[PDB]
Design a protein around this ligand. Structure first.
Ligand SMILES: NC(=O)c1ccc[n+]([C@@H]2O[C@H](COP(=O)([O-])OP(=O)(O)OC[C@H]3O[C@@H](n4cnc5c(N)ncnc54)[C@H](OP(=O)(O)O)[C@@H]3O)[C@@H](O)[C@H]2O)c1
Ligand SMILES: NC(=O)c1ccc[n+]([C@@H]2O[C@H](COP(=O)([O-])OP(=O)(O)OC[C@H]3O[C@@H](n4cnc5c(N)ncnc54)[C@H](OP(=O)(O)O)[C@@H]3O)[C@@H](O)[C@H]2O)c1
Ligand SMILES: O=C(O)c1cccc(C(=O)O)c1C(=O)O
Ligand SMILES: O=C(O)c1cccc(C(=O)O)c1C(=O)O
Ligand code: NA
Ligand code: NA
Ligand code: NA
Lengths: 347, 357
């Protein structure tokens, strides 16, 4: 079997990477947990075994077959090249390598073939992108995609363990102490890397990541650019609004598309139901639609509220929900690793 | 001055109608508070005065000049026509009369002229529609509107006191008692009138109101139909997704439009800033944008994240936030009443045009 390293083992995604690896079909002979110097020497479980956390260094990857990076774009930029030079296959959860033309950007149900071209690094897309691609690829295949407009409803776990804890504390202050939401102290959200921090409790923050020069955020632009690369079609117009809401896990998305050919709604529903990784949950007569609280803990992407636009012949609206730490991150990464093993690409 | 009645004085909107009337420019000689028989006989304040709550009945409107209704569409259907018959001018904050061609459907900054033709009932639009109209009217005036696609992020107060209390209870059960959100018991949300109820705590529910036969909800279709009427243009294409989130008050909206002519994006910002009732809050270099928690308690509607679509020449995206109990309900209604007073329109109607139930 393989020696597998999890870089960022101690964080929100890393905890789920451990769970997904424990549950994986990858033959794992040895597991290593890497994080920063401040976590080094502590212990975490792999199944019933205690694993000592190691500091991530330029020389830490000797003997490793597969390294799953989920420690921030900075850590991947710094250490992933050293891992690759040591002969490790890197699956990177971060944004750093995603737009590199020599790096496959993969959702296995959509573009697993792109893995065949890897040169030691495979990038996992952003969580919001991944779930949208699972919902939309079956439609693209049959009727084409001309454009996408999406508004997201993103859970705080996407911003890390600290953001989860900040959200819980803020909510308790309002509910238990009677603090007005606008009076709350915040330190992390909307973006740890930006200058000002705002409460998320009882709020909706229209900022994920930092702003780019075109006044879309980096998160919005990641959805645009990653979609084009994954679907291998720069002609698909994509514009996004990405919003943080007071949900701990599971992202929801209000997705509008226009197809190239008119796609009958009942056929769209069937095509989505038929697509691996997508689950149709759509029966409005019984108030059945995807819900964040029900999606948590599942690797599936759930799609419903599917309906024609009221005016645009080729327009369709839908609602897409998935656990942002599973299909949006740790499960997509472990699924990549399993696909590399299955296809003889761990080399 | 006037005798003013508030129908539904004891609920979420009614509390704000009281506040907005206490702060209004209406000359008020006498206030009456109406609600159900359960509440009748109890007392609520107007300023320092104790007001005895009355039962809403066909005979409760004698001597009333203006009545603000916010007690459910059924209550308005049943009693507003009797108030009109008694000589009252009704400002109705329910959906019931909104699509009646004899009823102006008004946001005062947008279409106050429609008040001139009233027949005793003036309808306040749905909260989601109102804030979107305040943001979009200045754009429409200059560059036109071809279509709107909107996804909403709606606060629980929109669904009433019970929904607020349910939300608070659920969050406490999760955060203090360790209940998993999927194990929570709900009784009200997403829709009190529908068959199944789901938790809102740590959730996003893509259902507001019941479903219609075209698979859009009544809320989504209200946005569509009300927009066309308020803007007096059935050619404006509007499709909506309306979603409840765990916010107590203030609705937010991700709004996409295509204009008829290209609208320079900085001029769009300027036009919105210049429009009464809309406040431009848009400086992304300093992370300035509208936020629900900051909008609560303000009558203004806040607009930012204003930016061009990446591909559609005439496409524009923005983020619109307003307090759904103030501009979305009680303030729009009181503002309508003030506008009626100012324009000499508080007068009994000559002919009854509304069905008596
Ligand atoms: N696909 C996606 O959309 C997606 C979603 C979420 C996250 N991610 C990626 O995963 C990263 C972590 O996310 P998270 O939610 O798990 O964050 P988190 O809960 O804050 O955890 C951060 C992790 O990174 C480690 N780390 C920080 N600085 C490090 C350094 N200099 N060297 C080695 N390790 C370091 C931390 O270890 P210590 O405990 O030792 O500090 C911790 O394990 C993100 O920054 C992002 O790039 C991707
Ligand atoms: N424009 C908008 O978007 C908007 C927004 C929110 C609400 N509204 C309208 O306002 C209504 C109330 O909303 P809310 O949030 O204030 O709800 P709420 O907190 O549940 O309050 C309901 C109010 O309606 C009264 N009521 C119920 N049954 C009645 C009856 N048979 N006769 C007279 N009054 C009765 C209640 O009186 P008791 O206390 O005596 O039961 C209470 O005053 C909604 O149903 C809707 O039609 C409009
Ligand atoms: O670097 C980060 O701190 C980060 C945090 C959350 C999500 C992402 C991402 O692009 O998926 C990223 C990222 O890799 O840019
Ligand atoms: O009657 C309701 O149950 C209701 C509840 C919340 C908002 C509205 C509304 O459209 O103003 C309505 C409504 O009047 O339709
Ligand atoms: Na296209
Ligand atoms: Na203004
Ligand atoms: Na006058």
């Amino acid at each position: 079997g393989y020696t597998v390293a999890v870089v960022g083992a101690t964080g929100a995604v890393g905890a789920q990477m451990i769970k997904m690896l424990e549950e994986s079909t990858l033959p794992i002979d040895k597991i290593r947990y890497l994080a920063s110097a401040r976590s080094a020497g502590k212990s975490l479980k792999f199944k019933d075994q205690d694993i000592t956390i190691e500091e991530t260094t330029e020389t830490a990857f000797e003997g490793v077959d597969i390294a799953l990076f989920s420690a921030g774009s900075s850590t991947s930029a710094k250490y992933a090249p050293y891992a690759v030079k040591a002969g490790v296959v890197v699956v990177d959860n971060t944004s750093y390598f995603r737009q590199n033309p020599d790096v496959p950007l993969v959702v296995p149900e959509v573009n697993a073939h792109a893995l065949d071209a890897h040169n030691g690094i495979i990038a996992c897309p952003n969580c919001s992108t991944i779930q949208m691609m699972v919902a939309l690829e079956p439609v693209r295949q049959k009727w084409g995609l001309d454009r996408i407009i999406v508004s997201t409803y993103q859970a705080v776990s996407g911003a890390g363990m600290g953001a989860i804890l900040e959200t819980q504390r803020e909510l308790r202050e309002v509910l238990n102490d009677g603090v007005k939401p606008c009076d709350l102290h915040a330190e992390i959200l909307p973006s740890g890397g930006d200058k000002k921090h705002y409460p998320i409790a009882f709020n909706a923050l229209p900022q994920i990541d930092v702003f780019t020069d075109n006044d879309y955020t980096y998160e919005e632009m990641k959805m645009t650019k990653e979609t084009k690369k994954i679907m291998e079609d720069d002609s698909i117009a994509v514009s996004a609004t990405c919003v943080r809401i007071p949900v701990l896990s599971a992202h929801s998305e209000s997705v509008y598309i226009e197809t190239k050919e008119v796609a009958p709604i009942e056929e769209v529903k069937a095509a989505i139901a038929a697509f691996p990784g997508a689950v149709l949950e759509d029966d409005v007569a019984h108030q059945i639609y995807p819900q964040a609280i029900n999606a948590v803990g599942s690797r599936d992407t759930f799609v419903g509220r599917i309906r024609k636009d009221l005016d645009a012949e080729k327009g369709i609206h839908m609602w897409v929900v998935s656990d942002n730490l599973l299909k949006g991150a740790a499960w997509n990464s472990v699924q990549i690793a399993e696909t590399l093993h299955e296809r003889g690409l761990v080399r």
